[PDB]
Amino acid sequence: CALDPLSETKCTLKSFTVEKGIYQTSNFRVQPTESIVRFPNITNLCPFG
Amino acid sequence: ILPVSMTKTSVDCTMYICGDSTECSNLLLQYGSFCTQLNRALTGIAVEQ
Numbered sequence A: 001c002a003l004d005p006l007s008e009t010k011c012t013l014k015s016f017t018v019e020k021g022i023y024q025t026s027n028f029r030v031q032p033t034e035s036i037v038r039f040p041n042i043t044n045l046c047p048f049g
Numbered sequence B: 001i002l003p004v005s006m007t008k009t010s011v012d013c014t015m016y017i018c019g020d021s022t023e024c025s026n027l028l029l030q031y032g033s034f035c036t037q038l039n040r041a042l043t044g045i046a047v048e049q
Helices: A004-013 B024-029 B034-048
Strands: none
Touching: none
16 A cells, blocks of 8 residues: 555555546645754743742 | 536545644544545535536
8 A cells, every 4th residue: 555656546445446537545744854842041940949 | 697616625634633643643543434435525526516
């Protein structure tokens, strides 16, 4: 199922002989990279004592 | 004046329901082949236009 979009259509269509036409398979998306984290620059410790 | 068609709106199921979430999709697959049916219905009316 993961070799080719052709075999991805055979996978999504649950058959081995597709017919002539167009076949919506899946949603592709760009994978997120360089996960960033932003916080305020404070450093005073909370008065839990 | 007569109308002859609509706009061909095709939705995604996992993108709408969960959307870049592995855990939500892994719980969504327990509900079965539901959004395959939903995608098939919307694809059918989109080719009917």
